[PDB]
Symmetry: C3
Subunit: 98 residues, 3 copies
Amino acid sequence: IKLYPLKKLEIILEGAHKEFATDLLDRAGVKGYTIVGNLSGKGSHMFNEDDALIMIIAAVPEELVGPLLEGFQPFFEAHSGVVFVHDIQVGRPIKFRN
Amino acid sequence: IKLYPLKKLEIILEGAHKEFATDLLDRAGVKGYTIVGNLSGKGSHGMYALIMIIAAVPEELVGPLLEGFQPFFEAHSGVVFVHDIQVGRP
Amino acid sequence: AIKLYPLKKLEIILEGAHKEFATDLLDRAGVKGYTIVGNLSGKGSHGMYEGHLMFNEDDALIMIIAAVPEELVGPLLEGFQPFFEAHSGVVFVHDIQVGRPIKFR
Ligand SMILES: Nc1ncnc2c1ncn2[C@@H]1O[C@H](COP(=O)(O)OP(=O)(O)O)[C@@H](O)[C@H]1O
Ligand SMILES: Nc1ncnc2c1ncn2[C@@H]1O[C@H](COP(=O)(O)O)[C@@H](O)[C@H]1O
């Protein structure tokens, strides 16, 4: 019944860069992630209407957000996409923090 | 990298109304959006054709956007969820 | 002009074969609606789930998005607990705002 805080990233980028983003999550110690495929978009939160986009959802301890955004920075300065950081609550924070 | 507050809308509606919804985001000054397609769902009318439009906007654009979506959602199925999020800028 | 009200939003990620178990818990608790994102992929503690590799589309990971009043969170999580102790998946609880509490409560 008790809930514990965590952060949740939504990383939206072109499907061709999936391996780069998942490798970056794995190296930072992220314990898991979910990928929503076949997304489409327009502009900037630029995306072309024909781009095959994905959204990577990653629940992470707050201590990993800074290093992850620092890792995604050179990528997002040269490629389309974004990272949305959410506050979430989970019942079992051990599943998400090493 | 500094974190900045934003609002993130999740607008869930029938795919047949996509153009109406994206035109309204365009006309309000929303700079970009992402669409999650081919959704299923349960609502007050029955089961499901549905899409989810994700837009991260400054808080000042929330009110005008909801005011724009109001006649639509008073006559059509669909929901809007407003989230508080943070985004990092260099 | 449009008043906003607080609500909670669950994201429930689980194997598609368990969709009915999850939607039945939501229906029973009085959840008024839900949205399902299908054919997902993901990395779990014991391996990868790749939706596009499944022979039956219904077996792929799904994410059930459910906006619920805060009072339904505890009973729902209590229901999901034995399931997630024996099956793959996660539940993320978010704070959101909505314009029409009656549509959800
Ligand atoms: N940290 C996380 N962030 C986002 N999604 C996650 C996370 N951890 C798990 N998931 C999702 O839950 C699914 C199942 O994870 P898990 O329960 O650890 O599975 P298993 O142990 O059987 O491999 C993952 O494939 C992923 O879709
Ligand atoms: N409580 C809810 N949580 C998540 N999605 C919802 C909820 N209520 C409605 N929806 C979505 O909105 C669609 C239309 O519902 P409605 O406006 O009640 O006809 C549903 O089929 C779902 O996809």
